[PDB]
Structure 1
Amino acid sequence: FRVVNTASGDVTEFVGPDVKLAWDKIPEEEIIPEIYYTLEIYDSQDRMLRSVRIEDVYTYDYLLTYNKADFALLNSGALGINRKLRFRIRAEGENGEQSVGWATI
């Protein structure tokens, strides 16, 4: 679970206008017919947004339009962008339960 577009000097910095996010395929996904990872996004304050139902995709991009147009206005009540972010993904069973725990940024 890593941010590919992280800046060279600082790992905790991403240069790109948007956030492009990638992760490795979970092991033992072959036996299970379907696994969808649930990705939790937060802000400087712990605010739930952009909970995405994703199947068979190992890379997610959080576009600038997806960032400011959708939830910046929704939460802040105005166009003002949000910069500080937290990410949290966890595998989910198609029929069974989810994974042992969420994955750290």
Structure 2
Amino acid sequence: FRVVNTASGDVTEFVGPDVKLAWDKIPEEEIIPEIYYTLEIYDSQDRMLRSVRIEDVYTYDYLLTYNKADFALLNSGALGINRKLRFRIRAEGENGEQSVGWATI
């Protein structure tokens, strides 16, 4: 679970306006076809921001529009961009259950 568009020298720093989230395939895709990934993004102050399901793709991007408008307004009722974020993801299925543990940056 690595961040695409990462800063040189130090890896804990962004380089692009939109963070690109790339992850490698879970091994058990073959056994169970109906499996998806629950990617939930947190804030700097340990407050939930997003809960998005990713399916049929092993990558995700976090658009500028999203952070700058939707999640600034609905939470802080104003315009802003949470610069410091936390991403965590796991695997789930319609009948198969959750992954053993959370995969976090």
Alpha-carbon RMSD: 1.0
Query: Contact conserved, 2:4 with 2:22, CA < 8 A, in 1?
Result: yes
CA–CA distance in structure 2, aligned partners of residues 28 and 81 of structure 1 = 36
Percent of residue pairs bearing the same amino acid type: 100
Q: In 2, Cα distance between the equivalents of 1:10 and 1:76?
A: 30
Check whether the contact 2:69–2:80 (CA below 8 A) recurs between aligned residues. Answer: no
Please list every run of 5 or more consecutive structure 1 residues that lacks an aligned counterpart in the other structure. Answer: none
Once residues 8 and 101 of structure 2 are traced to their aligned partners in structure 1, the CA distance between those partners, rounded to angstroms, is 29
CA-CA distance at 1:104 after TM superposition: 2.0
- Residues 21-57 of structure 1: per-residue CA shift (max 9 Å, x gap): 1000100111102111001111111111221111121
Q: Is the 8 A contact 2:67 2:80 kept in 1?
A: no
Checking the alignment, whether the CA contact within 8 Å between 2:41 and 2:49 is kept in structure 1 is: yes
Question: Following TM superposition, by how much is the alpha carbon of 1:90 offset from its aligned partner in structure 2, in angstroms?
Answer: 0.6
Distance 1:74 1:9 in 2: 35
* Aligned 1:54-93 pairs, distance under 5 A: 54-93=54-93
Number of residue equivalences: 105
TM-score of the pair, normalised by structure 2: 0.94
TM-score norm. by structure 1 comes to 0.94
Q: Take 1:68 and 1:74, find their aligned partners in 2: how far apart are those partners?
A: 11
| Contact 1:38–1:53 (CA under 8 A) maintained in structure 2 | yes
Asked whether the 8 Å contact 1:35–1:56 carries over to 2, the reply is no
Q: Kindly provide the CA deviation profile for residues 47-98 of structure 1, in whole angstroms up to 9, marking residues without a partner as x.
A: 1122111112111000000111110111111102210100000101221211
Note if contact 1:5-1:14 (Cα within 8 Å) is conserved in structure 2: yes
Confirm or deny: 8 A CA contact 2:35 2:96 kept in the other structure. no
* 1:14 matches 2:11: no
Q: Residue 95 of structure 1 aligns to a residue in which SS?
A: coil
